[PDB]
Amino acid sequence: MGSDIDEFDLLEGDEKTFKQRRTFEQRVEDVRLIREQHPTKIPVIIERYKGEKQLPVLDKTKFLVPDHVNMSELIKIIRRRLQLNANQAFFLLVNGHSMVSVSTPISEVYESEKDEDGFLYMVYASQE
């Protein structure tokens, strides 16, 4: 049944991510330097989800966030910089998932979710 149907994979010939722009050792050294001059700030990479067509792009991917800022405030900041409408869905995903704990300091989040290179990576999307 339906055995007469064959499948084909569709190829497409279509601003690289931070990990692609910088080597692992370069990123580690960046984090070391940041740790040295801004010991109360957290280095965060924030990028648009690759497949996201609804939300716009930030022209900046690399951020320093004060330790005390929680995810709620950061979501608000990012939504603000994106100039989103109040009713537009937005998700800030860390290690591929949204944060259950939206009230804790980003330094606390950092200690759990940081990459091996020392950056905390986030991706934003209109789903999850």
Residue numbers in the entry: -15 to -2, 4 to 117
What's in the article?
L. pneumophila inhibits autophagy by injecting an effector protein called RavZ into the cytoplasm. RavZ functions as a cysteine protease and irreversibly deconjugates mammalian Atg8s from PE to inhibit autophagosome formation. Unlike Atg4 that cleaves the amide bond between terminal glycine and PE, RavZ cleaves the amide bond before glycine. As a consequence, the RavZ-cleaved Atg8 proteins cannot be relipidated, leading to inhibition of autophagy.
